[PDB]
Design a protein around this nucleic acid. Sequence first.
RNA 1: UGGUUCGUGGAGCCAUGGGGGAAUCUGGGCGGACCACCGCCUAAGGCUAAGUACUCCGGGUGACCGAUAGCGCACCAGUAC
RNA 2: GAGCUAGCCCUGGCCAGGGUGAAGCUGGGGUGAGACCCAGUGGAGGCCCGAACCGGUGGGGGAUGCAAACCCCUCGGAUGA
RNA 3: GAAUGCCGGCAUGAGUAACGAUAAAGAGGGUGAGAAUCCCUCUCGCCGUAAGCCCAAGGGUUCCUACGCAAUGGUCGUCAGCGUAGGGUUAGGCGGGACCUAAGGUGAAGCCGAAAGGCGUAGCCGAAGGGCAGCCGGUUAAUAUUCCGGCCCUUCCCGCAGGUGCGAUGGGGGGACGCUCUAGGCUAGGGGGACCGGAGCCAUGGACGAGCCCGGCCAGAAGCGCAGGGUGGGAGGUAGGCAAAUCCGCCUCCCAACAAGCUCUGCGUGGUGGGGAAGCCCGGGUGACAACCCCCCGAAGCCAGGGAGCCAAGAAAAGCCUCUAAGCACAACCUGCGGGAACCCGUACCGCAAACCGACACAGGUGGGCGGGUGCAAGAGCACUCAGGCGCGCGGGAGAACCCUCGCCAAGGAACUCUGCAAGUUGGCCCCGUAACUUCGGGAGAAGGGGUGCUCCCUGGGGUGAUGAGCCCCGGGGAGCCGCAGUGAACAGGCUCUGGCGACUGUUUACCAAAAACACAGCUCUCUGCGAACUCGUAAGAGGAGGUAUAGGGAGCGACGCUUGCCCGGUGCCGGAAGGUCAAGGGGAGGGGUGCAAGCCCCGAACCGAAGCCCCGGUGAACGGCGGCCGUAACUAUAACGGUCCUAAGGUAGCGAAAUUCCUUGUCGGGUAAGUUCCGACCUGCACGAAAAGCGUAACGACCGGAGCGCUGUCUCGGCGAGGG
RNA 4: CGAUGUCGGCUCGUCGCAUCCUGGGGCUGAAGAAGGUCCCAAGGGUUGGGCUGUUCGCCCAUUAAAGCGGCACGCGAGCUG
RNA 5: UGGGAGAGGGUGGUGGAAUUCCCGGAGUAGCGGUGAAAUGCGCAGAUACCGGGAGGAACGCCGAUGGCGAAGGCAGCCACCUGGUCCACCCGUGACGCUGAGGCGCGAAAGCGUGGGGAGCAAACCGGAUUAGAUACCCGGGUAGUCCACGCCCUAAACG
RNA 6: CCGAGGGUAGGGCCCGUGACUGGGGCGAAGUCGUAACAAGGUAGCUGUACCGGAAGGUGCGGCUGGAU
RNA 7: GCGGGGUGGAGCAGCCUGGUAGCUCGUCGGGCUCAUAACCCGAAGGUCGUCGGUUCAAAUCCGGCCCCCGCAACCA
Lengths: 48, 275
Amino acid sequence: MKRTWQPNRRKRAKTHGFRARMRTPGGRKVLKRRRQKGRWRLTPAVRK
Amino acid sequence: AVKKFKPYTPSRRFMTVADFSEITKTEPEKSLVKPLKKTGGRNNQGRITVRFRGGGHKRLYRIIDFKRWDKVGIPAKVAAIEYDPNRSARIALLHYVDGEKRYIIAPDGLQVGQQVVAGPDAPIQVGNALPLRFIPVGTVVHAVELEPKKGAKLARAAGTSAQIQGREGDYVILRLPSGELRKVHGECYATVGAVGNADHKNIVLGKAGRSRWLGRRPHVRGAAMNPVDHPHGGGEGRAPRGRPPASPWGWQTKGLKTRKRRKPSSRFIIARRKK
RNA sequence: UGGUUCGUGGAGCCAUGGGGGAAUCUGGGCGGACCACCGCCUAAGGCUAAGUACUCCGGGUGACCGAUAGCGCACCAGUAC
RNA sequence: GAGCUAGCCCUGGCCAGGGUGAAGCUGGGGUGAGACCCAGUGGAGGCCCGAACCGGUGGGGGAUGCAAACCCCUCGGAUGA
RNA sequence: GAAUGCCGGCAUGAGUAACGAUAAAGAGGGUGAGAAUCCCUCUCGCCGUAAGCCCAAGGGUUCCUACGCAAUGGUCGUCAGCGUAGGGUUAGGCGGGACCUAAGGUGAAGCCGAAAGGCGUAGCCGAAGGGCAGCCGGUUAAUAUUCCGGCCCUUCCCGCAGGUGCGAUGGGGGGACGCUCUAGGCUAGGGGGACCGGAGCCAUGGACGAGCCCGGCCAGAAGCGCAGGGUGGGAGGUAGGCAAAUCCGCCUCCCAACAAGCUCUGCGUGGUGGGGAAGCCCGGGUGACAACCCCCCGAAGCCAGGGAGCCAAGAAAAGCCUCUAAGCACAACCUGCGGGAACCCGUACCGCAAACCGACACAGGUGGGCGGGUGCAAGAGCACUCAGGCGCGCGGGAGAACCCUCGCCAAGGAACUCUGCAAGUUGGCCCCGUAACUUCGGGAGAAGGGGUGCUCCCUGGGGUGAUGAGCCCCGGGGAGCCGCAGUGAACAGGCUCUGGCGACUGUUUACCAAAAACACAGCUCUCUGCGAACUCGUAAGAGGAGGUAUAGGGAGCGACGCUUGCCCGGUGCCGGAAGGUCAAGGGGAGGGGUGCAAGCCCCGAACCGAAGCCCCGGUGAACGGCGGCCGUAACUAUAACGGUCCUAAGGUAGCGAAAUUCCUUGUCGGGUAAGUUCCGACCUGCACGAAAAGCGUAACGACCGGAGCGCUGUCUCGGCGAGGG
RNA sequence: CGAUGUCGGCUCGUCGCAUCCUGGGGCUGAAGAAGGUCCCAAGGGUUGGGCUGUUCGCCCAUUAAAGCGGCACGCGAGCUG
RNA sequence: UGGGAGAGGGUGGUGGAAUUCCCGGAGUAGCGGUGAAAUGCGCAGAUACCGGGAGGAACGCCGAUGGCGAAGGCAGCCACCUGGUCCACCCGUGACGCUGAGGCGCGAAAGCGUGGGGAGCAAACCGGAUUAGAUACCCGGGUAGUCCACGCCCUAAACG
RNA sequence: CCGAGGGUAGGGCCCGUGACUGGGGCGAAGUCGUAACAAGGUAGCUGUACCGGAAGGUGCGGCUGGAU
RNA sequence: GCGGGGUGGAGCAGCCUGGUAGCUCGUCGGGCUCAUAACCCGAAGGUCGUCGGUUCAAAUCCGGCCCCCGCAACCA
Ligand SMILES: [Mg+2]
Ligand SMILES: [Mg+2]
Ligand SMILES: [Mg+2]
Ligand SMILES: [Mg+2]
Ligand SMILES: [Mg+2]
Ligand SMILES: [Mg+2]
Ligand SMILES: [Mg+2]
Ligand SMILES: [Mg+2]
Ligand SMILES: [Mg+2]
Ligand SMILES: [Mg+2]
Ligand SMILES: [Mg+2]
Ligand SMILES: [Mg+2]
Ligand SMILES: [Mg+2]
Ligand SMILES: [Mg+2]
Ligand SMILES: [Mg+2]
Ligand SMILES: [Mg+2]
Ligand SMILES: [Mg+2]
Ligand SMILES: [Mg+2]
Ligand SMILES: [Mg+2]
Ligand SMILES: [Mg+2]
Ligand SMILES: [Mg+2]
Ligand SMILES: [Mg+2]
Ligand SMILES: [Mg+2]
Ligand SMILES: [Mg+2]
Ligand SMILES: [Mg+2]
Ligand SMILES: [Mg+2]
Ligand SMILES: [Mg+2]
Ligand SMILES: [Mg+2]
Ligand SMILES: [Mg+2]
Ligand SMILES: [Mg+2]
Ligand SMILES: [Mg+2]
Ligand SMILES: [Mg+2]
Ligand SMILES: [Mg+2]
Ligand SMILES: [Mg+2]
Ligand SMILES: [Mg+2]
Ligand SMILES: [Mg+2]
Ligand SMILES: [Mg+2]
Ligand SMILES: [Mg+2]
Ligand SMILES: [Mg+2]
Ligand SMILES: [Mg+2]
Ligand SMILES: [Mg+2]
Ligand SMILES: [Mg+2]
Ligand SMILES: [Mg+2]
Ligand SMILES: [Mg+2]
Ligand SMILES: [Mg+2]
Ligand SMILES: [Mg+2]
Ligand SMILES: [Mg+2]
Ligand SMILES: [Mg+2]
Ligand SMILES: [Mg+2]
Ligand SMILES: [Mg+2]
Ligand SMILES: [Mg+2]
Ligand SMILES: [Mg+2]
Ligand SMILES: [Mg+2]
Ligand SMILES: [Mg+2]
Ligand SMILES: [Mg+2]
Ligand SMILES: [Mg+2]
Ligand SMILES: [Mg+2]
Ligand SMILES: [Mg+2]
Ligand SMILES: [Mg+2]
Ligand SMILES: [Mg+2]
Ligand SMILES: [Mg+2]
Ligand SMILES: [Mg+2]
Ligand SMILES: [Mg+2]
Ligand SMILES: [Mg+2]
Ligand SMILES: [Mg+2]
Ligand SMILES: [Mg+2]
Ligand SMILES: [Mg+2]
Ligand SMILES: [Mg+2]
Ligand SMILES: [Mg+2]
Ligand SMILES: [Mg+2]
Ligand SMILES: [Mg+2]
Ligand SMILES: [Mg+2]
Ligand SMILES: [Mg+2]
Ligand SMILES: [Mg+2]
Ligand SMILES: [Mg+2]
Ligand SMILES: [Mg+2]
Ligand SMILES: [Mg+2]
Ligand SMILES: [Mg+2]
Ligand SMILES: [Mg+2]
Ligand SMILES: [Mg+2]
Ligand SMILES: [Mg+2]
Ligand SMILES: [Mg+2]
Ligand SMILES: [Mg+2]
Ligand SMILES: [Mg+2]
Ligand SMILES: [Mg+2]
Ligand SMILES: [Mg+2]
Ligand SMILES: [Mg+2]
Ligand SMILES: [Mg+2]
Ligand SMILES: [Mg+2]
Ligand SMILES: [Mg+2]
Ligand SMILES: [Mg+2]
Ligand SMILES: [Mg+2]
Ligand SMILES: [Mg+2]
Ligand SMILES: [Mg+2]
Ligand SMILES: [Mg+2]
Ligand SMILES: [Mg+2]
Ligand SMILES: [Mg+2]
Ligand SMILES: [Mg+2]
Ligand SMILES: [Mg+2]
Ligand SMILES: [Mg+2]
Ligand SMILES: [Mg+2]
Ligand SMILES: [Mg+2]
Ligand SMILES: [Mg+2]
Ligand SMILES: [Mg+2]
Ligand SMILES: [Mg+2]
Ligand SMILES: [Mg+2]
Ligand SMILES: [Mg+2]
Ligand SMILES: [Mg+2]
Ligand SMILES: [Mg+2]
Ligand SMILES: [Mg+2]
Ligand SMILES: [Mg+2]
Ligand SMILES: [Mg+2]
Ligand SMILES: [Mg+2]
Ligand SMILES: [Mg+2]
Ligand SMILES: [Mg+2]
Ligand SMILES: [Mg+2]
Ligand SMILES: [Mg+2]
Ligand SMILES: [Mg+2]
Ligand SMILES: [Mg+2]
Ligand SMILES: [Mg+2]
Ligand SMILES: [Mg+2]
Ligand SMILES: [Mg+2]
Ligand SMILES: [Mg+2]
Ligand SMILES: [Mg+2]
Ligand SMILES: [Mg+2]
Ligand SMILES: [Mg+2]
Ligand SMILES: [Mg+2]
Ligand SMILES: [Mg+2]
Ligand SMILES: [Mg+2]
Ligand SMILES: [Mg+2]
Ligand SMILES: [Mg+2]
Ligand SMILES: [Mg+2]
Ligand SMILES: [Mg+2]
Ligand SMILES: [Mg+2]
Ligand SMILES: [Mg+2]
Ligand SMILES: [Mg+2]
Ligand SMILES: [Mg+2]
Ligand SMILES: [Mg+2]
Ligand SMILES: [Mg+2]
Ligand SMILES: [Mg+2]
Ligand SMILES: [Mg+2]
Ligand SMILES: [Mg+2]
Ligand SMILES: [Mg+2]
Ligand SMILES: [Mg+2]
Ligand SMILES: [Mg+2]
Ligand SMILES: [Mg+2]
Ligand SMILES: [Mg+2]
Ligand SMILES: [Mg+2]
Ligand SMILES: [Mg+2]
Ligand SMILES: [Mg+2]
Ligand SMILES: [Mg+2]
Ligand SMILES: [Mg+2]
Ligand SMILES: [Mg+2]
Ligand SMILES: [Mg+2]
Ligand SMILES: [Mg+2]
Ligand SMILES: [Mg+2]
Ligand SMILES: [Mg+2]
Ligand SMILES: [Mg+2]
Ligand SMILES: [Mg+2]
Ligand SMILES: [Mg+2]
Ligand SMILES: [Mg+2]
Ligand SMILES: [Mg+2]
Ligand SMILES: [Mg+2]
Ligand SMILES: [Mg+2]
Ligand SMILES: [Mg+2]
Ligand SMILES: [Mg+2]
Ligand SMILES: [Mg+2]
Ligand SMILES: [Mg+2]
Ligand SMILES: [Mg+2]
Ligand SMILES: [Mg+2]
Ligand SMILES: [Mg+2]
Ligand SMILES: [Mg+2]
Ligand SMILES: [Mg+2]
Ligand SMILES: [Mg+2]
Ligand SMILES: [Mg+2]
Ligand SMILES: [Mg+2]
Ligand SMILES: [Mg+2]
Ligand SMILES: [Mg+2]
Ligand SMILES: [Mg+2]
Ligand SMILES: [Mg+2]
Ligand SMILES: [Mg+2]
Ligand SMILES: [Mg+2]
Ligand SMILES: [Mg+2]
Ligand SMILES: [Mg+2]
Ligand SMILES: [Mg+2]
Ligand SMILES: [Mg+2]
Ligand SMILES: [Mg+2]
Ligand SMILES: [Mg+2]
Ligand SMILES: [Mg+2]
Ligand SMILES: [Mg+2]
Ligand SMILES: [Mg+2]
Ligand SMILES: [Mg+2]
Ligand SMILES: [Mg+2]
Ligand SMILES: [Mg+2]
Ligand SMILES: [Mg+2]
Ligand SMILES: [Mg+2]
Ligand SMILES: [Mg+2]
Ligand SMILES: [Mg+2]
Ligand SMILES: [Mg+2]
Ligand SMILES: [Mg+2]
Ligand SMILES: [Mg+2]
Ligand SMILES: [Mg+2]
Ligand SMILES: [Mg+2]
Ligand SMILES: [Mg+2]
Ligand SMILES: [Mg+2]
Ligand SMILES: [Mg+2]
Ligand SMILES: [Mg+2]
Ligand SMILES: [Mg+2]
Ligand SMILES: [Mg+2]
Ligand SMILES: [Mg+2]
Ligand SMILES: [Mg+2]
Ligand SMILES: [Mg+2]
Ligand SMILES: [Mg+2]
Ligand SMILES: [Mg+2]
Ligand SMILES: [Mg+2]
Ligand SMILES: [Mg+2]
Ligand SMILES: [Mg+2]
Ligand SMILES: [Mg+2]
Ligand SMILES: [Mg+2]
Ligand SMILES: [Mg+2]
Ligand SMILES: [Mg+2]
Ligand SMILES: [Mg+2]
Ligand SMILES: [Mg+2]
Ligand SMILES: [Mg+2]
Ligand SMILES: [Mg+2]
Ligand SMILES: [Mg+2]
Ligand SMILES: [Mg+2]
Ligand SMILES: [Mg+2]
Ligand SMILES: [Mg+2]
Ligand SMILES: [Mg+2]
Ligand SMILES: [Mg+2]
Ligand SMILES: [Mg+2]
């Protein structure tokens, strides 16, 4: 039956994207934390 | 009239529809329509702020003229009477000699082909608009402004009408369709006659679906919910109210008056509605 | 109403949201309700090193660890997953 | 976090075939005029049967499954909320 | 040494379950160290409204080839979506962008918020909507509407020529719209041909035949033809379309009007270019100078923005045409022609799936288009079959119990069991024929029954033709033939009687409950005069609603019919300018601290002083409530009647052992041989009762009872057989 | 209580004997036939139905008889529900 | 042909008296009701009085022992639309007549459906009295209904 | 072929009977009240509507077959 | 189990606060009437369910016992 992951790139980018993160005070902090931790990818990679 | 159906389905047995006899034009004046932004009952927060709304037929909003003192002294011909889905009343297409076309709410008796006009000099005849002060006391009237140059606010629904009861100073005394006695300003415009389509109230929707067409989603009783959802919620088996009957938000709903007491417009209401 | 050790207490002091509302050294604040006396101080403008805190970074040193320990990672780890 | 799920908004798409035959309209009868009746035409409907499609009634199987909700038979809706 | 401790290693169960749909395999040849599993051939089976084909998501090199088999593959492996390497995606016309807007998002102006931030007309962004110019074939191991070939087209720049008051983010027109049903004419696609072309074949008893088998098209500018769409022309006035306007709108007149004309599209033809089978022979060669024709069926697609009807009344903006303003009229724009110019991204491959979502090469899920033939009334149903694709990545045996899925059964026929659970029966179509009741629609496919194939003859009507031939469609009437059996296989209701509950179609606990629950039309109460009530938010702002009492919110009830009694003491709500209580504040009789003093400071009685509460009244489709004891009638029994106490008033109609009845399997009647169930009654109703509605009600229900007929392995009562284990 | 699954049915039994039947006896208010009552005896037997979830019980039709109890009110890694 | 009388019928307007409610003034100790009382209303200002407003219903005098209509029935006033009828003239038609099973229409009051309206009155209902009881008669309240529209019902001491 | 009739199925009319139930008639020596006849103690009767242990009451309109 | 009652013939007060048994009805006597109902005037009848106890004295306070009313009897 229909499971929970139904990929959609526009949705993916418009949600967890870089610009989305930068727009909100909460999201900017995500990027701060991820950088501080040293994540290789601050934001979900998506092929546009 | 209202049109009955034969009972060839369980619903058509009781369903009744408007007769549409007064309609002469089944197409809206293109330059007078704009898209109607449906809401679903949700505000600018996306939050439902009026429950049980949505899924109705798509509508095109007709631009109606509720000022009419806008074009004093310039007569107009009644070109057509049309269906308007955004109101209970019918609407009239006015072709001004001016060359301008505008919609008004169609009064009862208004004939296609006849001529009407707004202004202090207007003949007291169906479809004319005048300040209240220049209208004979006792004549019935609709589409009444509440304050000068602010637009027709009163008596707009199908079959409704206000009536002038007398004069007092700058103000005149109207008996609103609810029976409330109120002082309205003399300079407030109004259109003589009663609103048409008075048969509107005798329509029997006939089935669940018809309310859905009208954008009215199912309404759920408090008694059929749970204690989280509603004051009337819960109880093993069926249950009475067990408290004074209330809205989902807690306030009492049988009898409890709600008009703000210290309201400035209190000075102008003479007799709150009957019955 | 907050702040002070002060939780309405005899509750001053410092601060101020509302109302009222002065004076210029014979002016004003303070010394724990208030008054007198005796003293202290100069509100409603601003700046000011050093002594003080911290450790991403560099170095020195361990009755500190020695690959299940010591940082999550001695190794291509905030990786694989 | 509404890429699952619920509701709503915008914009598109889908519903084999068969069946029943509302109003209306036309003609005839009827009457003072009518109501009305009859035939034809007509093609209405949260109407009927039944695929797609949406479901999930009963039973059997499955139960370290093919599957963390599946399979077979049967069954509900299918121009409409 | 224990914490169902933590991390790791290794055991046990055990050579055990399992190896993922029961569509299915068999042989020969080849390769190789090794072959049921890789390649080739033949035979066999499965899919075919797909298990075939083409898009879009999503995946991201999985595509093609060479060389490999450690691991991955549920076995094997020489094979592979696996390892290594090399190659492969070509666009002015396809899709997106350099175009437009939709919800929404963002946001000059402006508004709000301790901070972060929240709003917000314009504008901007935002598409699977609008707009917009490429069709057929060929070619590669692998790309093609992209390269090539043929034939067409679009914009931009510039120049020439003819033309005109040219010029816009501004005005106007247009774009521009629903659901259902539908006309004419076409096309896609299909069937047949005694006609045309074709390698061939004559078997096994017959046929050298009007024999069999195969194929008889595709694209195409202008012109034209057929069919549709769109559209009146002229003049005068003009105060409206936030400037202007010759445009548009409005008024008057003249000519035209189911004509045309003008214009746009579809289809046909069309210079020209393409393709072109069976079979044979090693993807190709040949067939072949291939033929390329007539008839019929015919769309849900096209002409289209067509037509009719209906109510629930059915986007926007740009491109486009027209108008004029600044401006400028050496400009500028339009029309025709010519040359030049024409950018960025995608394009491989899988795509109902072994490449996507499900940890798996997972019997699950995934949107759009194509989807052939015959027969069965129709069809996208069902059976077989074309093209194409497959036989599902363990096999070989054996023929126990037992299991699953299936077939049949003597006599009986529900005796099974909580229950006919399950499996039988019934089954499509035509005709005949159908009851109570009913809201007159229905109930109804009620029930029940007859027919059903093939053959010859006679005949009726329609379509296409022509009015005829042929072809296709719908029939009717005779006489016959065979079988146990003619919807001969497959797909396809068992029926009736009678209660409860819910009017009804619908909705619901994704994953133990689909129902009597929710919703539902409809009835009633109540709130709301509009900056409405109400809801969300601290606010701004929103929704309500661009609505206005025939409207909007809350609540209860739940189609419809006949009805809905009595109680306002208590609670609530509504009304009540009196009176009572009443906080801050006002007022300051009087009292106190202090000082030599003026003075400063504290307390403080009377009286004034809101809402709310008290108090008076109303109110039930407001919250709710709706009695006790004792006696009495020509025999008993019961009690119409009476006495008395209490209450705010003591349950009216109707219903009643009930979805409610404890005693209870109440009593009586029906049905049965036998009835704790069921139905009809009775009424001492433990403990029904009138919008948490009372009593009924046709139709409806995968709801829950009872009964009968039909028929059956449910059973007496088991047996045999099949296939997967 | 870091789980001993709980009524009834089905299936399969096995034991006890305080014996329902059949076998053997004594007494009888035992004429006979048939009963009553007690003693011995566990070898075998102990039916089909209607009602209800029922065990139980009532009822139908028969019968030699239609026995009562134990086995976690025997039996759910055996089924039902 | 010419003339008359009449609450005959239908639609639309419209006039005053009165009852009720509401607003203002003024005013105070009761008012109301009955056989007599009480319930009720009133110092929270009633009754009685003056002014204003609102709304519904019925039309006093004329009015009659009258008129009109087939019956039911019809009454302020105006206008329109319309039926029946009588008289005079003795002009026209030439028996075209009478009755009438069915049929069709009309049909007071109450009653029903849908929607208005609602002053007075008033079934039901509540209270106060009377009474042995009083589910009545009398009194204080009071909802349907009485009024309008459209559609039903079709009864009667629909009687002379 | 038709055909007595037999069989299956569904209808129609009639008769008998049925727990229980509705009123009706008679019986009469019971019970409760007194509705009608006089102005019957509220004139009666009436169609209709609602109500009440029961006669009945009341509303609305009608009749005199009403005393004074 | 918890609460509440038993008083002239019927139905209710009196009990809490000890002394002091009351109201309506019925009953008997007498009026009015032909008689009857109604009505009027008079009168009778309860040792307080019992047995015990506290007190000077108990319908009254307390305890035992009988009887009647109401509520409860759940998870199981
Ligand atoms: Mg999706
Ligand atoms: Mg993905
Ligand atoms: Mg996307
Ligand atoms: Mg997308
Ligand atoms: Mg983003
Ligand atoms: Mg990096
Ligand atoms: Mg990572
Ligand atoms: Mg991130
Ligand atoms: Mg109308
Ligand atoms: Mg109808
Ligand atoms: Mg109809
Ligand atoms: Mg009709
Ligand atoms: Mg129907
Ligand atoms: Mg129905
Ligand atoms: Mg309408
Ligand atoms: Mg409508
Ligand atoms: Mg209509
Ligand atoms: Mg209309
Ligand atoms: Mg439209
Ligand atoms: Mg527009
Ligand atoms: Mg709008
Ligand atoms: Mg809007
Ligand atoms: Mg928004
Ligand atoms: Mg938000
Ligand atoms: Mg938001
Ligand atoms: Mg709301
Ligand atoms: Mg809503
Ligand atoms: Mg309208
Ligand atoms: Mg309505
Ligand atoms: Mg209504
Ligand atoms: Mg709508
Ligand atoms: Mg509603
Ligand atoms: Mg509801
Ligand atoms: Mg619930
Ligand atoms: Mg919640
Ligand atoms: Mg809570
Ligand atoms: Mg709550
Ligand atoms: Mg509740
Ligand atoms: Mg509940
Ligand atoms: Mg409850
Ligand atoms: Mg509940
Ligand atoms: Mg419960
Ligand atoms: Mg309950
Ligand atoms: Mg409930
Ligand atoms: Mg319910
Ligand atoms: Mg409750
Ligand atoms: Mg309550
Ligand atoms: Mg105002
Ligand atoms: Mg202290
Ligand atoms: Mg302090
Ligand atoms: Mg301050
Ligand atoms: Mg000083
Ligand atoms: Mg000083
Ligand atoms: Mg200070
Ligand atoms: Mg100090
Ligand atoms: Mg100091
Ligand atoms: Mg220094
Ligand atoms: Mg410093
Ligand atoms: Mg060490
Ligand atoms: Mg290590
Ligand atoms: Mg480590
Ligand atoms: Mg480190
Ligand atoms: Mg490590
Ligand atoms: Mg969603
Ligand atoms: Mg969803
Ligand atoms: Mg027809
Ligand atoms: Mg028509
Ligand atoms: Mg149809
Ligand atoms: Mg249907
Ligand atoms: Mg169906
Ligand atoms: Mg199922
Ligand atoms: Mg089954
Ligand atoms: Mg089975
Ligand atoms: Mg199972
Ligand atoms: Mg399945
Ligand atoms: Mg299935
Ligand atoms: Mg459908
Ligand atoms: Mg269909
Ligand atoms: Mg539709
Ligand atoms: Mg439907
Ligand atoms: Mg130890
Ligand atoms: Mg463990
Ligand atoms: Mg363990
Ligand atoms: Mg084993
Ligand atoms: Mg398997
Ligand atoms: Mg199978
Ligand atoms: Mg092999
Ligand atoms: Mg091998
Ligand atoms: Mg096929
Ligand atoms: Mg992947
Ligand atoms: Mg490729
Ligand atoms: Mg390998
Ligand atoms: Mg290998
Ligand atoms: Mg190997
Ligand atoms: Mg492997
Ligand atoms: Mg392997
Ligand atoms: Mg595997
Ligand atoms: Mg290569
Ligand atoms: Mg090209
Ligand atoms: Mg550019
Ligand atoms: Mg844009
Ligand atoms: Mg686009
Ligand atoms: Mg394009
Ligand atoms: Mg483009
Ligand atoms: Mg082309
Ligand atoms: Mg030129
Ligand atoms: Mg030009
Ligand atoms: Mg439009
Ligand atoms: Mg569109
Ligand atoms: Mg064909
Ligand atoms: Mg072709
Ligand atoms: Mg043509
Ligand atoms: Mg002009
Ligand atoms: Mg050649
Ligand atoms: Mg040739
Ligand atoms: Mg179609
Ligand atoms: Mg059209
Ligand atoms: Mg827009
Ligand atoms: Mg560029
Ligand atoms: Mg490509
Ligand atoms: Mg699939
Ligand atoms: Mg999984
Ligand atoms: Mg596989
Ligand atoms: Mg078939
Ligand atoms: Mg078929
Ligand atoms: Mg099928
Ligand atoms: Mg296979
Ligand atoms: Mg396999
Ligand atoms: Mg058998
Ligand atoms: Mg049978
Ligand atoms: Mg049988
Ligand atoms: Mg059953
Ligand atoms: Mg069949
Ligand atoms: Mg029947
Ligand atoms: Mg019928
Ligand atoms: Mg049949
Ligand atoms: Mg044959
Ligand atoms: Mg089959
Ligand atoms: Mg069927
Ligand atoms: Mg049936
Ligand atoms: Mg029952
Ligand atoms: Mg029912
Ligand atoms: Mg239902
Ligand atoms: Mg339900
Ligand atoms: Mg319903
Ligand atoms: Mg329903
Ligand atoms: Mg449906
Ligand atoms: Mg569920
Ligand atoms: Mg659940
Ligand atoms: Mg869940
Ligand atoms: Mg779950
Ligand atoms: Mg769950
Ligand atoms: Mg379920
Ligand atoms: Mg269901
Ligand atoms: Mg419901
Ligand atoms: Mg109703
Ligand atoms: Mg809020
Ligand atoms: Mg706002
Ligand atoms: Mg708004
Ligand atoms: Mg709005
Ligand atoms: Mg509104
Ligand atoms: Mg409901
Ligand atoms: Mg009250
Ligand atoms: Mg009450
Ligand atoms: Mg309460
Ligand atoms: Mg006073
Ligand atoms: Mg006061
Ligand atoms: Mg003083
Ligand atoms: Mg109460
Ligand atoms: Mg209640
Ligand atoms: Mg009272
Ligand atoms: Mg009552
Ligand atoms: Mg009973
Ligand atoms: Mg019973
Ligand atoms: Mg019942
Ligand atoms: Mg129940
Ligand atoms: Mg009960
Ligand atoms: Mg009980
Ligand atoms: Mg019982
Ligand atoms: Mg019971
Ligand atoms: Mg018994
Ligand atoms: Mg019995
Ligand atoms: Mg009884
Ligand atoms: Mg309720
Ligand atoms: Mg109720
Ligand atoms: Mg019922
Ligand atoms: Mg009925
Ligand atoms: Mg159901
Ligand atoms: Mg068997
Ligand atoms: Mg077999
Ligand atoms: Mg076998
Ligand atoms: Mg086998
Ligand atoms: Mg335990
Ligand atoms: Mg354990
Ligand atoms: Mg013997
Ligand atoms: Mg003997
Ligand atoms: Mg034995
Ligand atoms: Mg033994
Ligand atoms: Mg029993
Ligand atoms: Mg015997
Ligand atoms: Mg047991
Ligand atoms: Mg046992
Ligand atoms: Mg079990
Ligand atoms: Mg068991
Ligand atoms: Mg066991
Ligand atoms: Mg057991
Ligand atoms: Mg159960
Ligand atoms: Mg008179
Ligand atoms: Mg003569
Ligand atoms: Mg009448
Ligand atoms: Mg009525
Ligand atoms: Mg009234
Ligand atoms: Mg009495
Ligand atoms: Mg009533
Ligand atoms: Mg009524
Ligand atoms: Mg009369
Ligand atoms: Mg008379
Ligand atoms: Mg007469
Ligand atoms: Mg015979
Ligand atoms: Mg009388
Ligand atoms: Mg009398
Ligand atoms: Mg009398
Ligand atoms: Mg009585
Ligand atoms: Mg009465
Ligand atoms: Mg007389
Ligand atoms: Mg006790
Ligand atoms: Mg006492
Ligand atoms: Mg005393
Ligand atoms: Mg003593
Ligand atoms: Mg004593
Ligand atoms: Mg004493
Ligand atoms: Mg509990």
